[model samples]
Target: MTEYKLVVVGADGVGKSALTIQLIQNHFVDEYDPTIEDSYRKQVVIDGETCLLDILDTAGQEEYSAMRDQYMRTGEGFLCVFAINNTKSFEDIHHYREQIKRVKDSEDVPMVLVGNKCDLPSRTVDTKQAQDLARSYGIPFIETSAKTRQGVDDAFYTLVREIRKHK
Candidate 1:
C-alpha cells in the first residue's frame, strides 16, 4: 500500500475544511463560517493510491498557536491555504511557512500555496501572487475554489505528484 499524508492549515475561515471536503469528499460548505473548536479530517484515494488528508483548521486569530504547531509538525506534506478576498490571510504566508517548518524541519518538504475561493469574483489574490510566493519559498502553488471545485483536485493531486517526482 502506498500511504501518504496531506495536511491543510491556515486561518479558521480560509476554507481549509471546505477545500478538503470539496476535493476529497465532493461536498460544499454552504455556511462559510469559522471552523469549530474541533478540526476536520478526511481520507481519499486517487489513482489507487491512498492519501490521508489531515487538517488542523487553526483558529483565524490563532488563540493557541502552539496547538497549531503541534499538528503541523506531523505533516508529511502541506497545502497552505489563504482566503483570496482577505489581505490578512494572503499576507500570512510567512507565518504559515514558519509554522510548517516546525514539523517539516528540512527545507525540501513538498508544499503548495493555495489561494482558496477562486469562485468569487471580488477575490483579490491571484495565481501570480501565489506562484511568486511559492517560487520565493521554493514550493508549488495553485489557486482553488471549493465552491466551484476549481483547481481543488489539481492542488491536492499535484502535491502528490510532486512527492512522487522526488521519490
Candidate 2:
C-alpha cells in the first residue's frame, strides 16, 4: 500500500495530541499532557485509493527545535492546529508556515489549517479570520473538536486528499 508521512503541529495546549489520538484511535483524550513526540500508522481508503498514513505528533516544546526541522522536512503534508479559544496559538501558525516553507523550500505545501477545541464555550479567534488566513495561503481550513469528534475526520481527509492531488 502507498504511504504518506503527515505531521501535526501547533503551539502548546492547542490539542494536536488530542486531535491525533482521536484520528488514530477514535478516542478522545480528556487530560492534557505535554507531548515529546509520537508516530501512528493507520490504513484507510480515500477517493477509492487505499494507503497507509504515518502521522507524526511533533513536539510542542521549544526544546524540540532540532527535531522540529527534521519533522517538517520529512512530512508530505501537515495539519497546522490551533485552538479557537486561543488567539496566540492562531498567531503562532505563521511561524509554522514559515518553517514548513523554509524546510520544504516551497511556498505551496499540502496542508490544512485546523482550528481545534470548538467545543469550548467561548472562542477568541474568529472563524472568518482563520478561513482568510487559510485562503491567503491557498490551503484548506476546518474547525475541529476532539471532544465532540466534530470535523476531526474531515480535517485528516482534506489533508490526505490534497497530498494525493499534489502527488
Candidate 3:
C-alpha cells in the first residue's frame, strides 16, 4: 500500500486538530488543545486503491514554529488550512504555502488550500477569494466543517491524489 505523509498547517484555532481528529475518529472535538504535534495512522481507500495515511497534526501556535521545518521537509503533501471566520488565519496560508515550497525545494509540491469551519454562518473569507488563491497556487481548494464532517474526507483524499500526481 502506498503511504502518504500529510501535514496539516495553519494558525491557531483554525481547527487543524479538529479536522484531523474528525477524519480519523469520525467525531467532532468541541474543545481546542494547543497540540505541539501529533501523528496518526489510518488505512483508507482512495480511488479504489488501498493506502495508508500518516497524518501529522502540527501546532499552530507561534511558539511552536521552531519545529515546523523538520516536518515540512519530510511531508509528502500539505493541507494549508484556514478558518473561514478568521481573516488572519486565511492570510497566514500564504506563509505556510511559501514555507512548504521552500522546505521541499520545489515549486510543484503537492498541497491543498483548505478553508475550514464552513458550517458556521459567518465567514470572513469568501469562497471566490479562496478559490482564486488556490487557482493561483495551482492546487485544489476545499471548504470543510470538522463539526459537521463536511468535505473533510475530500480534503485529505485530494491531497493523496495530489501526491500521486507529484510522484
TM-score for predicted model 2 compared with the true structure: 0.94
Question: Which digits, one per residue and each the tens of the lDDT, describe model 2 over residues 33-56?
Answer: 686678889887888889899999
Best by TM-score: 3
In angstroms, the error of model 3 at 115 is 0.5
Best by lDDT: 3
Please report, in order, the local distance difference test score of every candidate based on alpha carbons: 0.74, 0.90, 0.91
Residue 28, model 1, lDDT: 93
What value of lDDT does candidate 2 attain over all alpha carbons?
A: 0.90
Give me the runs in candidate 2 sitting further than 4 Å from their true place: 63-67
Model 3 agreement with the true structure over 63-149: per-residue lDDT tens digits: 535466876777999999999999999988998988888889899999999999999999989999999999999999999999999
TM per candidate: 0.82, 0.94, 0.95
RMSD (Cα, Å) for all candidates, in order, is 2.7, 1.4, 1.5
